[PDB]
Amino acid sequence: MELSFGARAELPRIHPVASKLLRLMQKKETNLCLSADVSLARELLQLADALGPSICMLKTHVDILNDFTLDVMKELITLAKCHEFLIFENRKFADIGNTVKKQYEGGIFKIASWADLVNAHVVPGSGVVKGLQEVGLPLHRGCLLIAEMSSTGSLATGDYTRAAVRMAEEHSEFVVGFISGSRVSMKPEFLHLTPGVQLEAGGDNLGQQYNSPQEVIGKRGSDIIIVGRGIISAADRLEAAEMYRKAAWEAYLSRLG
Amino acid sequence: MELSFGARAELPRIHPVASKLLRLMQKKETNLCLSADVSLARELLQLADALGPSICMLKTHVDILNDFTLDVMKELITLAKCHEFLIFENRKFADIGNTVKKQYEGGIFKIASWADLVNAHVVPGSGVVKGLQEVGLPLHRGCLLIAEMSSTGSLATGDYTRAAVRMAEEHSEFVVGFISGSRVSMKPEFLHLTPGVQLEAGGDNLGQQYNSPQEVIGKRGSDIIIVGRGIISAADRLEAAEMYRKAAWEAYLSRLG
Ligand SMILES: *[C@H](C)c1cc(=O)[nH]c(=O)n1[C@@H]1O[C@H](COP(=O)(O)O)[C@@H](O)[C@H]1O
Ligand SMILES: *[C@H](C)c1cc(=O)[nH]c(=O)n1[C@@H]1O[C@H](COP(=O)(O)O)[C@@H](O)[C@H]1O
Structure with missing residues (x-):
């Protein structure tokens, strides 16, 4: 039986970062992540x-911010706290343990700090x-594993996807969910976040493929839903964000019954 | 059927960056990449x-350089020109095409520039x-595809590895080789670079596994060979690099005949 975001936030095995996210999604009626x-x-x-x-x-x-500083991130955190949203850094970590540890904590970006x-x-x-x-647990952070990708020719399928799910299950103190195109775990403590979303059918010219909020949330x-260009390229970004929010929210409610 | 690095530098279908590399390997008697x-x-x-x-x-x-500036990379390029070595940025790009384009060209690092x-x-x-x-072609850059990984539990096996080889073959105007644990393509135009190398048996506490220069080059x-901690952790990094150089070079010389 499907649980509401509010109920999932209270599950005994819920990670605190997931609980915080789930509570604000219910409070605000939004399951939209802006890319x-x-x-x-x-x-x-x-x-x-x-x-x-x-x-x-x-x-x-x-990695694409020409004028990054840690003060920019301080100010972003203030906005996050005021408007109540979480901050999710895109960088798709993909290296050996020893290297990713340093990439996460260190360098100019100090990603784990914000x-x-x-x-x-x-x-x-x-x-x-x-x-x-090793870096995230002390800093009270969470992680998503990339179980599926939205792009043409993705190798994150089959046994690869299943490996991601087992890895997540076995590291539930830190892993709070997945980047995926669908539900991949039957455990309600895990979040599923889906990029490759637009209202209309289509793709880009470098292998991105799109599905709709109703398809991805509902079916x-x-x-x-994670949405970048569908919002950012629109003439009215606020109206676009609202269409996406309403679309994803209604799809969730319908699945909920 | 084994060709020397110098002869491979003259192969008809060789990328100019690969040619430059192979020529300096032959001139300097080194097949060692310092990590x-x-x-x-x-x-x-x-x-x-x-x-x-x-x-x-x-x-x-x-991504781990705390005091990165483009002036630091300018000085690095001077040393690369002086001593004759190529610069290989580690960042293991792993995102949709539209995103990796920007990550490569832009941000603070401007990786494609150096x-x-x-x-x-x-x-x-x-x-x-x-x-x-799209970024690297006019700049005469090349790319290596990660066909295999050194770390325990690597999913870069089997059909995944085969997919990497096919992808390299189909994009030979830009792909010059592979990060792999062994030879994965029979086409001598492709370079094979292997991390997870140390003179002694072992690994680290975060999944890294080591093989020797003789095993990796020779067998x-x-x-x-790509070598980080085997060299960087020595008291005398020069002496360490020389040991690794002789190991990898003699292993190459022996498989030649
Ligand atoms: C990473 C979150 C990811 C994974 C994936 O399989 N597909 C993706 O597109 N992404 C990232 O999500 C946004 C998508 O933006 P658009 O809505 O296509 O503009 C990108 O930032 C992509 O890297
Ligand atoms: C990327 C080059 C890569 C791929 C891989 O499968 N295994 C790796 O270790 N690496 C990179 O190579 C160095 C290895 O350094 P050590 O010799 O283990 O210190 C790391 O920089 C790793 O990211």
Whole structure:
């Protein structure tokens, strides 16, 4: 029997980062994650402020931010706290444990110092998780494993996907869910976040493929839609965010009955 | 049927970056790539200067460099030109094509501006190569595809590895080789670079596994050894690099005949 986001937030085995997310999704009636794929700090902060009320999460892309500083991230956190959304850094960690540990904590970005959530590929084996968790657990963070991808020719299928799910299950102190195109775990403590979402059919010219909020939330059983260009390229970004939020929210409610 | 590095540099279908690499490997008698996994620019540059004569390639890890600037990379390029080695940025690109394009060209790091070689995971499908190619092609850059990984539980096996080889073959205007544990393509135009190398048996506490230069070059048929901690953790990094250089070079010389 399907549980509401509010009930899932209270499950005994729920991770605190997932509980926080689930509570604000219910409170705000949004299961929309904005993919903030922009080059400038001013654009990032303007979108976070204007769309904050409509979103549960803002997916940053610090590797493409031309004018990144840690002060930009301080200010983003203030917006996150004010508007109540989590910060999810896009960087798709995909290296050996020892390396990802340093990539997560260190460098100029210090991702673990400001990102509530990160995501990681499972291709290196479970050391990728063990390395990230060494930094993330003390910092009270969570992680998503990339169980499926939205792009043409994705190899994250079959036994690979199943490996991601086992890895997540075995590291539930840190792993809070998945990047996936559908529900891949039957355990309600895990979140499912789906990119490759637009209202209309289509793709991009570098292998991105799109499915609708109704398809992914309603038919395929995911929890959260991640949307970049569908919102950012629109003339009215606030209206676009609202259409996506309403679409994803209604799809969830219908599945809930 | 085995050709020397110098002869391979003259193969008809060889990429110019691969040719430049193979020529300097032959001239300097080195098939050693230093994995410069350090957090300070001053250490990076001191290692680059001191070990430059012993290496064919320096693998940078800019995501862990706390005091990165483009001026640091300018000085690195001077040393690369002086001592004759290529610069390989470690970041294991693993996202849809439209995203990896921006990650490669942009942000603070502007990787494409200074790195001869990049590496990409093949899990997103061939869009990952297409996206990097749009940036790197005019700049005469090349790419290695991660066909196999060194870490315990690696999913880069079987049909995954075969998919990486096919993808490299179909994008030979930009893909110059592989990160792998062994020879994975029979086409001598492709480079094989192998991490998870140390003179002694063992591993680390986060899933890394080591094989020797003689096993990897000599028996598995790889071209270049990538070595981080085996060298970086020594008291005398120069002496360590020389040991690794002689091991890898003599292993190559012996498989030649
Ligand atoms: C990573 C979250 C990911 C994984 C995937 O399989 N597909 C993806 O597209 N993404 C990321 O999500 C956004 C998608 O943005 P658009 O809505 O296509 O503009 C990108 O940031 C992509 O890297
Ligand atoms: C990426 C080059 C890679 C791929 C892999 O399968 N295994 C790896 O270890 N690496 C990278 O190579 C160095 C290994 O350093 P050590 O010799 O183990 O210190 C790391 O930089 C790793 O990310």
